[PDB]
Design a protein around this ligand. Structure first.
Ligand SMILES: [Mg+2]
Ligand SMILES: [Zn+2]
Ligand SMILES: [Zn+2]
Lengths: 98, 1338, 83
DNA sequence: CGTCCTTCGGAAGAGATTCAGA
DNA sequence: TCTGAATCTCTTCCAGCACACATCAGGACG
RNA sequence: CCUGAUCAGGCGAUGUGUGCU
């Protein structure tokens, strides 16, 4: 099984799971630890920021690859915004200070 | 863009500021046209337009109409992403308690109002009343009432009086409370009490109040009035294949809440009666408590079947929330997965990869190369070209491969060698080929393992994958300085076949001009592969200052050794291949190549080793056949003799001569002896089997048996497995843990009958169940360790301090288990090591101890180095460089920026898959040496030996050199045949004692008088049958009569003239106190001896042991210690438990401790103990070690015990990782004396914050503060962090977020998890350079 | 071909500054800043960057000096646009 | 149809329950 | 009369991936 | 983002079981 860029999920903008659904692999928590064990930082940043979420960042990434400029932009994961709306939907104010 | 996250409570003004519109109706959709309701849950006039820039009623479909709301239906024309952002509110008609602030345990309302949680449940759930502002009445402020109690209170108090029900009463209480008067009166009642539980309750309440007034919150914000709803794209309504819509549970939850709210609005509109609106408000309270956290109630509400609904807290918590599911581990594009296979022709910096996966992974790269060269005009043309597959795309794909690394991954990624980089090589097929030397590092065989591949898109990721993660850079493990490119099985069988020698083959003794015509001989066939021959070889010794000296000579070797010599590079000598070359020898061959020549010859030499190993293992043809396992012909006779001996033992037992256990142990001993005899017979029969002529007469040599070479080379198996294939297979176990007396006399070459196979099946299913549960315990332990670590990056260069631990080589009492060279390798000293001769600075105090300095210490025989451990480092928020040491995966010192908590916890928890899950007579010294006593107070007896009046005498064996090589522990009152520094002989008994009796030995002599001994109250005359005993017996503690209750015996030693002999040094006589179960041996009117017994006083390892160390459980029967020095005595007469009084010499004595009954004391009255002494026996507790001895003592205890576990199972772990996990364990501390500081007294704070608190006060002219360190478990020192995102991504999220909400706890960044969550750079090396730039920016 | 980067690690002795300096250099070469100072083997810009580091003529100070000398020329051609 | 009517686990943490000496 | 030390009661979590299959508010009044 | 012709349509959450590592 292999996935370049296919359909995305709906409640949190991530790739799907499986083969019959055209989905990608799961970069799990132990693999995040194994890249933190090296000093790899840009690899983990794009592995859970641009290749996986951050819809503006990944459209800019696809245009930059097909134009020939290997350059990413950080942005922010959309599922973290989902987490803010879920905690904020309780009686728990959460913000982002400046 | 932003620093620290803030969290607080939600004001009703804040919720109305968030919300855009009110939600009133429960209906969602219209189901004919699926446009939603007017307002409902899903909406248009509250949450946004459905599609991209289109109105609802069909008016505006263009950006030119952007911005204005509709005049018909009111739809602010904006992107549908806005329905992911806007929110709504529900105006409740009656206030409602918030369930996270009601049943969190501890209840925040329950210890703010100082009220029982049962009574607050009775107030909130509409069955009771409670007084609010009673006045000058017969009632209190916190009195709870019922219906008849309220009726009576009204009929006595029809005047001003108030008592209500529900959330209104709680909100009135929280509104009518002034926090200032509460803080003042609680400080008053702290100062005006002495009770400890009161001080605990009052300090929790005063911390809540003084952290609540510091925040800007209000206690009536804990009761909801305006409740928010979630945005509709986060609770979506999915179209199932059918008629209806499948929905999430939240739509049902909000629908029930809105229906109940509308019915309550109707009942308050139409002026309903009181019981009906009580039932209505109770149902609304239970609905909101079902929505915010379901399951904390009784029967949790269900949707359609036997499953509870999933609420908002369930969409955060657990294995499948948003922390452990969607934010730590994400699913990733540009990736793939398949099954692996071998392909040995690769070089170990590249891997195979299928053409189909390559073309599916590199679609945008192929697009960008096709519409750059001009072979396609646009993206549609490029997509049709790479779908039609013209011939040019394989050329373009071979151009985009060429230098682009990919990341291979295996699914259980334990340690950091599980993700590696490779250059791709294209394969027709569907299976990932994988180089064979890397599979031992993956711990992946080829019985169907699947691996995943990831692609680095950007340019920095390709450079990280080449510089850090490439397969030719990870050739040293970070757990220990050992190679990880160990040649595994076919290659070592091939090399062991290639370098051996038989005593005669083709081409014997002829002389050869070099290795080249040796290969030209063997390829033609004139000379056999292993036949000894004088050759001329030429070796390069690099003895000059980097310049290669060529020497050449004639060696006497085989042919296979010469053909192997055509591969070894220049620098290595020839004596490394003149041996037999098993597995150990080829591993140290690669190690010496890496030590001498560097990196590139070692990589290319590993590739040439694997190639020549596979080639000559193919040329050998080492098969295996049923005739290659030689059964001995002594096996039958040894079994017949063992059966004759068990028959003789059974004929002893069948007439009344021996017992059962005696026969059982006799049988198991003689079967173990017969087992070892059969094992030695078969091993001799294999190893000296082949006898062949050489010039006539026969000659023995080592054998060319197939299974013998496969066991001797070390490819597969050990001696025990070939023992089970040729000799008898021992004595198999049983589920009781016992061992069956009838062994398995057969072996696998012969048959087995039914019962022997069944007995084998017992142990087989035992081992399988052990591994199957061992995997889950290993994973959970690795998770807890890496989440208590990783706040910790090497972030300085030198602390510039002098503290540190004292390293010594370890001795248990057997042979020396780990010498000094493995422990004091690669770690910077603290003190400059004194030369033992005279006062020379042997090493300077800031030198990294590499192997040459370790050998110099081995020369000059130093036994203890004060080295700079991590646990005494003095770095704020991190660990400096010269307290950590060497990197162990590279050569140099640690770099400023490399994360060490993660590699530490991975190297500790990775061997957890290899850890199992389910006397006291004398001292027999081993070698000749010299005797050193340690902490003894002894006296010479009349017999000439030495007897011991101390309790912790250590007996160290000095050798002839000056070092200790054996050590033991002699208990109280033994016999020493030696003295201070006398000479021993090999095998001599030097110390001997009694396992049963605690001796009551003496120091002086003369007449003996009894005092306070009563035949009837204290002692009695116990006489055994036919005078088996005739002596006075002291009765025990509680069983004596109350008239003799307070009386205690004393045996007083007086002179020959009756006058009192005093203790030499004091003026108190030498009387001995008799405890319970004492038997008077030497009687009244007896001159006695020195060292004289006056009475007779008789009496789980594995992975849970590592868990119990790192969690710091106290054991189930702890060993008590003495918290303060001084003499020891007894008080209370054991009303359940017996008091113990300890009194110092020159200080105060406010100490007492009540020992259980039920714990035997290893202390008399006269043992004036020091703090750090045991009083009873048992396992020793880590909290006791920390609060009595010191931090260095507790870290030595933890490193020695967990190294005993991991070293008994045969695994090497360097001590840095265990010490840094200890540092993260003992981080928090408590305050004792505040002084001029800013902390309350009985308070807990982290050690770094209090350390830089009184570092500005100490350089100035004020007084500091005093800290007492406090050791926590790893699942407590992770839930107690200066951050809540770590403590919420760990275990339970509810109590962490409720404490953060009531405190207003502002979370700064700069951990590792707090940046992985928020999606920015880690402060490990690359991003650590970036964060240095950002910190000098601000 | 640059299977091992050990010479580059010797010439920038941190193992972590090498990635940043090589990334800055390869972003200069790909987007279109310069041409390489070593004759290529039809390789990629990553391998060319680490190859130049192994030659020993690029690190952070040389990159900053050459960027300042290129930035002064943009201000040395702007002075002619004023006159 | 339109609308609506409702019984098998190990331990730490925190809140009740005896207790004995004053 | 009253307070510390032992005793009784609610909470949770348990490795990592793949596949297949059933189920999604129904019943009845208007 | 994908699949078909300046356009049209696709996008789940639970359990339960099996099997690999
Ligand atoms: Mg396997
Ligand atoms: Zn309109
Ligand atoms: Zn330090």
């Amino acid at each position: 099984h292999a996935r370049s860029t296919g359909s995305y999920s709906l409640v949190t903008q991530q790739p799907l799971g499986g083969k019959a659904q055209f989905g990608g692999q799961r970069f799990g928590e132990m693999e995040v630890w194994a890249l933190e064990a090296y000093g790899a930082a840009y690899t983990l940043q794009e592995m859970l920021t641009v290749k996986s979420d951050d819809v503006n960042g990944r459209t800019k990434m696809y245009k930059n690859i097909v134009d020939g400029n290997h350059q990413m932009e950080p942005g922010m994961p959309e599922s973290f915004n989902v987490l803010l709306k879920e905690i904020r939907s309780l009686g728990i104010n959460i913000e982002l200070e400046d | 863009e932003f620093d620290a996250i803030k969290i607080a409570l939600a004001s009703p003004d804040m919720i109305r500021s968030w919300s855009f519109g009110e939600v009133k109706k429960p209906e969602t959709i219209n189901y004919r046209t699926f446009k939603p309701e007017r307002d409902g849950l899903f909406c248009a006039r509250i949450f946004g337009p459905v599609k991209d820039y289109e109105c609802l009623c069909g008016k505006y479909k263009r950006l030119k109409h952007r911005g204005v709301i509709c005049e018909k239906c009111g739809v602010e024309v904006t992107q549908t992403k806005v329905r992911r952002e806007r929110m709504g509110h529900i105006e409740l008609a009656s206030p409602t308690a918030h369930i996270w602030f009601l049943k969190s345990l501890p209840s925040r309302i329950g210890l703010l109002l100082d009220m029982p949680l049962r009574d607050i449940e009775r107030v909130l759930y509409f069955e009771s009343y409670v007084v609010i502002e009673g006045g000058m009445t017969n009632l209190e402020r916190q009195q709870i009432l019922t219906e008849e109690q309220y009726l009576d209170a009204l009929e006595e108090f029809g005047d001003e009086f108030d008592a209500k029900m529900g959330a209104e009463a709680i909100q009135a209480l929280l509104k009518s409370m002034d926090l200032e008067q509460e803080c003042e009166q609680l400080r008053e009642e702290l100062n005006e009490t002495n009770s400890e539980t009161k001080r605990k309750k009052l300090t929790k309440r005063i911390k809540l109040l003084e952290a609540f007034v510091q925040s800007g919150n209000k206690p009536e914000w804990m009761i909801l009035t305006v409740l928010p709803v979630l945005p509709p794209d986060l609770r979506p309504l999915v179209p199932l294949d059918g008629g209806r819509f499948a929905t999430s549970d939240l739509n049902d939850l909000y629908r029930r809440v809105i229906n109940r709210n509308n019915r309550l609005k109707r009942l308050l509109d139409l002026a309903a009666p009181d019981i009906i609106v009580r039932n209505e408000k109770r149902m609304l309270q239970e609905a909101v408590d079902a929505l915010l956290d379901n399951g904390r109630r009784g029967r949790a509400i269900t949707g359609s079947n036997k499953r509870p609904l999933k609420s908002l807290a369930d969409m955060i918590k657990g294995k499948q929330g948003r922390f452990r599911q969607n934010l730590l581990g994400k699913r990733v594009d540009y990736s793939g997965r398949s099954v692996i296979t071998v392909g040995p022709y690769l070089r170990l910096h590249q891997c195979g990869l299928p053409k189909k996966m390559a073309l599916e992974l590199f679609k945008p790269f192929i697009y960008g190369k096709l519409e750059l060269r001009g072979l396609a005009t646009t993206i549609k043309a490029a997509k049709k070209m790479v779908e039609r597959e013209e011939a040019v795309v394989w050329d373009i794909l071979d151009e985009v491969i060429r230098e682009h690394p990919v990341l291979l991954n295996r699914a259980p990624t334990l340690h950091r060698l599980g993700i590696q980089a490779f250059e791709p090589v294209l394969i027709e097929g569907k299976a990932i080929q994988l180089h064979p030397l890397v599979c031992a590092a993956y711990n992946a065989d080829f019985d169907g393992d699947q691996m995943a591949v990831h692609v680095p898109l950007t340019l920095e990721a390709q450079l990280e994958a080449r510089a850090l993660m490439m397969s030719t850079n990870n050739i040293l493990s970070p757990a220990n300085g050992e190679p990880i490119i160990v040649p595994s099985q076919d290659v070592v069988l091939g090399l062991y076949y290639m370098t051996r020698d038989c005593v005669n083959a083709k081409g014997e003794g002829m002389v050869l001009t070099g290795p080249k015509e040796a290969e030209r001989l063997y390829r033609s066939g004139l000379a056999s592969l292993h036949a000894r021959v004088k050759v001329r070889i030429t070796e390069y010794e690099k003895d000059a200052n980097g310049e290669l000296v060529a020497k050449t000579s004639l060696k006497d070797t085989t042919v296979g050794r010469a053909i192997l010599w055509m591969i070894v590079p220049k620098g290595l000598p020839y004596s490394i291949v003149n041996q037999a070359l098993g597995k150990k020898a080829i591993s140290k061959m690669l190690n010496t190549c890496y030590r001498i020549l560097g990196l590139k010859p070692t990589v290319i030499f590993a590739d040439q080793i694997m190639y020549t190993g596979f080639a000559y293992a193919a040329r050998s043809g080492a098969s295996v056949g049923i005739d290659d396992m030689v059964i001995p012909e002594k096996k039958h006779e040894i079994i017949s003799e063992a059966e004759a001996e068990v028959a003789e033992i059974q004929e002893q037992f069948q007439s009344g001569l021996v017992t059962a256990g005696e026969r059982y142990n006799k049988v198991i001993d003689i079967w173990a002896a017969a087992n070892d005899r059969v094992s030695k017979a078969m091993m001799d029969n294999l190893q000296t089997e082949t006898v062949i002529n050489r010039d006539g007469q026969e000659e023995k040599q080592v054998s060319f048996n197939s299974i013998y070479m496969m066991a001797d080379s070390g490819a597969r198996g050990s001696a025990a497995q070939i023992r089970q294939l040729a000799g008898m297979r021992g004595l198999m176990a049983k589920p009781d843990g016992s061992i069956i007396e009838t062994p398995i006399t057969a072996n696998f070459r012969e048959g087995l009958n039914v019962l022997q196979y069944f007995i084998s099946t017992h142990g087989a299913r035992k081992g399988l169940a052990d591994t199957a549960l061992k995997t889950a315990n290993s994973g959970y332990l690795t998770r807890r360790l890496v989440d208590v670590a990783q706040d910790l990056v090497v972030t300085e260069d030198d602390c510039g301090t002098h503290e540190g631990i004292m390293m010594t080589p370890v001795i248990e009492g057997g042979d020396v288990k780990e010498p000094l060279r493995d422990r004091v390798l690669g770690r910077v000293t603290a003190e400059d090591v004194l030369k033992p001769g005279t006062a020379d600075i042997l090493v300077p105090r800031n030198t990294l101890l590499h192997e040459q300095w370790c050998d110099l210490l081995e020369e000059n025989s130093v036994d203890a180095v004060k080295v700079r451990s991590v646990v005494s480092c003095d770095t704020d928020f991190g660990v400096c460089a010269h307290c950590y040491g060497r990197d162990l995966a590279r050569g140099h010192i640690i770099n400023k920026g490399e994360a060490i908590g993660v590699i530490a916890a991975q190297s500790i928890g990775e061997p957890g898959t290899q850890l199992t899950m389910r006397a006291e007579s004398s001292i027999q010294v081993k070698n000749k040496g010299s005797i050193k006593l340690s902490n003894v107070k002894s006296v010479v007896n009349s017999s000439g030996k030495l007897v011991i009046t101390s309790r912790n005498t250590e007996l160290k064996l000095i050798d002839e050199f000056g070092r200790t090589k054996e050590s033991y522990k002699v208990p109280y009152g033994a016999v020493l045949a030696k003295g201070d520094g006398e000479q021993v002989a090999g095998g001599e008994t030097v110390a001997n004692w009694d396992p049963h009796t605690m001796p009551v030995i003496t120091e002086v002599s003369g007449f003996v008088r009894f005092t306070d001994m009563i035949d009837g109250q204290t002692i009695t005359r116990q006489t055994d049958e036919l005078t088996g005993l005739s002596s006075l017996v002291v009765l025990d503690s509680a069983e004596r009569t109350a008239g003799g209750k307070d009386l205690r015996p004393a045996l007083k030693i007086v002179d020959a003239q009756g006058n009192d002999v005093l203790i030499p040094g004091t003026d108190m006589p030498a009387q001995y106190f008799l405890p319970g179960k004492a038997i008077v041996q030497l009687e009244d009117g007896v001159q006695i001896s020195s060292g004289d017994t006056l009475a007779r006083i008789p009496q789980t390892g594995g992975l849970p042991r590592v868990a119990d160390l790192f969690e710091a459980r106290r054991p189930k029967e702890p060993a008590i210690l003495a918290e303060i020095s001084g003499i020891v005595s007894f008080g209370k007469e054991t009303k359940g438990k017996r008091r113990l009084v300890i009194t110092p010499v020159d200080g105060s004595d406010p100490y007492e401790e009540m020992i259980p009954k039920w714990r035997q004391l290893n202390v008399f009255e006269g043992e004036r103990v020091e703090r750090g002494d045991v009083i009873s026996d048992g396992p020793e507790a880590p909290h006791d070690i920390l609060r009595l001895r010191g931090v260095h003592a507790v870290t030595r205890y933890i490193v020695n015990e967990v190294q005993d576990v991991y070293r008994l199972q045969g695994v090497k772990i360097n001590d840095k990782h265990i010490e840094v996990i200890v540092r993260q364990m003992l981080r928090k501390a408590t305050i004792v004396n505040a002084g001029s500081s800013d902390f309350l007294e009985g308070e807990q704070v982290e050690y770094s914050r209090v350390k830089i608190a009184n570092r500005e006060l100490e350089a100035n002219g004020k007084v500091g503060a005093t800290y007492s360190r406090d050791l926590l478990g790893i699942t407590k020192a992770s839930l107690a962090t200066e951050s809540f995102i770590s403590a919420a991504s760990f275990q339970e999220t509810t109590r962490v977020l409720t404490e953060a909400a009531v405190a207003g706890k502002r979370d700064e960044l700069r951990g590792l998890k707090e940046n992985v969550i928020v999606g920015r750079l880690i402060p490990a090396g690359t991003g650590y350079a970036y964060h240095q730039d950002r910190m000098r920016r601000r | 071909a640059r299977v091992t980067v050990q010479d580059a690690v010797e010439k920038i002795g941190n193992r972590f500054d090498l990635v940043l300096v090589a990334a800055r250099r390869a972003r200069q070469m790909q987007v279109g800043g310069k041409d390489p100072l070593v004759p290529e083997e039809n390789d990629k810009t990553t391998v060319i960057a680490l190859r130049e580091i192994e030659e020993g003529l690029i690190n952070n100070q040389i990159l900053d000096v050459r960027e300042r000398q290129e930035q002064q020329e943009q201000e040395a051609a702007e002075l002619q646009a004023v006159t």
